[PDB]
Amino acid sequence: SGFRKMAFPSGKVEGCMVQVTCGTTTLNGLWLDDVVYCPRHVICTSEDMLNPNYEDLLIRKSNHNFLVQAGNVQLRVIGHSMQNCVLKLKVDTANPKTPKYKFVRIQPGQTFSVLACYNGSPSGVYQCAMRPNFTIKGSFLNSSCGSVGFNIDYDCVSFCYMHHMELPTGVHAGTDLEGNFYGPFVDRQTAQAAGTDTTITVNVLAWLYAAVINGDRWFLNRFTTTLNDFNLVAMKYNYEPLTQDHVDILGPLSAQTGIAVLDMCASLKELLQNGMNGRTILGSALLEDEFTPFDVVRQCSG
Amino acid sequence: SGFRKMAFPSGKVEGCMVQVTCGTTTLNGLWLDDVVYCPRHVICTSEDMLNPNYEDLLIRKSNHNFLVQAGNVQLRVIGHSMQNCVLKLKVDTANPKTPKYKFVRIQPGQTFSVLACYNGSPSGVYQCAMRPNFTIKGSFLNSSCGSVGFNIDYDCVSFCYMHHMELPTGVHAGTDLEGNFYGPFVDRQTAQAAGTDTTITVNVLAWLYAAVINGDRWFLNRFTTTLNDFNLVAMKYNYEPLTQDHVDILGPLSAQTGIAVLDMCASLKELLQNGMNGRTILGSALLEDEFTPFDVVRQCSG
Ligand SMILES: *C(=N)[C@H](C[C@@H]1CCNC1=O)NC(=O)[C@@H]1[C@@H]2[C@H](CN1C(=O)[C@@H](NC(=O)C(F)(F)F)C(C)(C)C)C2(C)C
Ligand SMILES: CC(C)(C)[C@H](NC(=O)C(F)(F)F)C(=O)N1C[C@H]2[C@@H]([C@H]1C(=O)N[C@H](C=N)C[C@@H]1CCNC1=O)C2(C)C
């Protein structure tokens, strides 16, 4: 038993990380087959950041303006194209450590593992959620760009995130691996803010189910509520509305514990209304929303 | 910016996870060069969990009673020895994926990543601390045993933890990689309980320095303390005594912030009195004690 913020094992993705140099700019690339994916802002100088002309700055580049460094082995760029906000560099060498993979775009509320990298070298692995405001609360310093978000399904790596920037609130913004931004953000050093976030309610109900599965039961009450009446208490506390989608999705945890979603919703209502009376749930003083229903079933089943 | 409970990249340890079967018992082994390290309780039946005689159980065992599986490949056990509470199986094949490694025994307050494993397969990676009471707050199910804890310095994996048992408070006990238990615990299903846990004070201090590095000062005050006055107050919150050794270790974080350790001690003392008054520090409403001074310098300074 026990319940941790658990990351996916990172080995398949560590075998894919390279250093991409364009001029003085170094960041990370994902090397899959004979293509290296990286943020297009690698080609930007200091200047070329308030108003980058990407189409224009790209055409002024040769293949040999890009040094791609695969540990200590230098990869020769034999092609270059931009897809939205990712640069795709065709390399003379295919990655022998390429996993079973697809590119996937996630929803707000869905979780992933980040492999934080610097100069092509994996640094740390952590679990994140896509905030409803389409930011992630990562841990990213200078030269973290080209760090990727992933899920594993069996032996298949699902790449869902590439890291691009930090917003003034210390939160992070990026794209899928096709270079489409999550959220209303642009890859220019200009004034950008995170929108006001809300709490991923389905994830909190799923986290209370995890608490119950670990014999942490104190928050359980007698009230049954309606879906509407819980979504009215919820919207006052900046919680996401909970939809039948979200209720049917808690099925396996309601079955596992025998506790009906609406009985659990009546608990979280009471918790929203009061607080935790100097008690914790699974050793947190806050209502956690960065564990999906699949995360709780996954962890608890092994 | 940002601050995450962050684990080492798991690939170098994922390269080492095997399945060890005995009769009906399957658990995890650590495959390094031509030896598999696993829990000696793999040789236990249903009966023998209470007062196992390990020397008498093992003498009855041949090399060929030990089924070691690396992915598909079954390894050939050509030797067995007992070292404390670990079983060592000499196999006919050196692991080609053996990373640079050492075995280290850690102290309470030290942090490590766990690769959670079932049947030699990886579940997940998470960050843990050796609690003052020689337990860890893990996430471990049936057949979790042999799952290991580790740190990585550059390219070297230092193995520090092997999983053996869950105590009745839902916390975890294990050995070093020489099979010496952390704490007073034994590999028997005898009545055992962890002693009352204390907060790792040097870690909470290190984490407050991390919050200041990240731009947060709200919790500081114009007061200082003596080390002794600090220890009289903190010992009333079930905080570990802070030593001069702990003061010395916080020295780099002090230099970086320009806040003397005893001034930050004064800060913690007031936080213990007042709590957070609806505020959070690095997204927590509790005082976080599972980041070392070293972990903070690692994530906030690189
Ligand atoms: C990645 N390699 C870096 C810095 C990382 C990202 C997360 N934390 C970091 O410190 N990314 C960048 O330098 C990007 C890059 C230009 C500016 N930029 C930013 O992250 C800046 N932020 C913004 O301009 C904002 F707020 F709008 F997002 C910066 C002020 C340097 C943090 C480009 C092309 C967006
Ligand atoms: C919890 C249980 C009551 C079963 C027991 N605990 C106590 O006997 C104690 F309370 F005394 F410690 C206990 O863990 N074990 C009994 C037996 C080994 C260990 C065990 O079964 N290990 C499992 C590995 N195959 C993983 C476990 C179960 C879920 N989470 C874990 O970590 C040994 C100590 C020899």
Numbering used by the authors:
A (entry chain B), B (entry chain A): 1 to 302
Please share excerpts from the published article on this structure:
The SARS-CoV-2 Main protease (Mpro) or 3C-like protease (3CLpro) is a dimeric cysteine protease responsible for the cleavage of the viral polyproteins 1a and 1ab in 11 sites, including its own N and C terminal. Mpro substrate recognition has unique features and is specific for Gln residue at P1, hydrophobic residues at P2, and small side chains such as Ser and Ala at P1’. The absence of similar sites in human proteases together with the importance of the enzyme for the viral replication makes Mpro a primary target for antiviral discovery and development. Herein, we evaluated the effect of single mutations in the active site of Mpro from circulating polymorphisms on the kinetics and inhibitory constants of nirmatrelvir and ensitrelvir.
All crystal structures were obtained in the orthorhombic space group with one dimer of Mpro in the asymmetric unit, following the pattern of the seeding samples used, whereas the G143S mutant was solved in the monoclinic space group with a similar crystal packing but with two dimers in the asymmetric unit. C145 and G143 residues are responsible for stabilizing the oxyanion hole, where the backbone nitrogen interacts through hydrogen bonds. For the mutant G143S complex, we observed that the pyrrolidone group from nirmatrelvir that occupies the S1 pocket appears in four distinct orientations, one to each chain in the two dimmers composing the asymmetric unit. The mutant G143S complex revealed that the substitution of a glycine residue with a serine changed the charge distribution around S1 subpocket, causing multiple conformations of the pyrrolidone moiety. As a crystallographic consequence, the multiple conformations of the pyrrolidone caused the break of one of the orthorhombic 2-fold symmetry axis, shifting this crystal to a monoclinic space group with cells like the above. The mutation of G143 to serine shifted the charge distribution and/or stereochemistry on S1, preventing the stabilization of the pyrrolidinone group into a single conformation. A similar effect might explain why this mutation also depleted the enzyme efficacy versus a substrate containing Gln side chain at P1. The only exception was the G143S mutant, where nirmatrelvir Ki value was 0.96 ± 0.23 μM. Mutants N142S, R188S, A191V, A193S, and A193T showed similar relative catalytic efficiencies to the WT. Mutants G143S, Q189K, and A193V showed diminished relative catalytic efficiencies in comparison with the WT, with a reduction of 33-, 3-, and 2-fold, respectively.
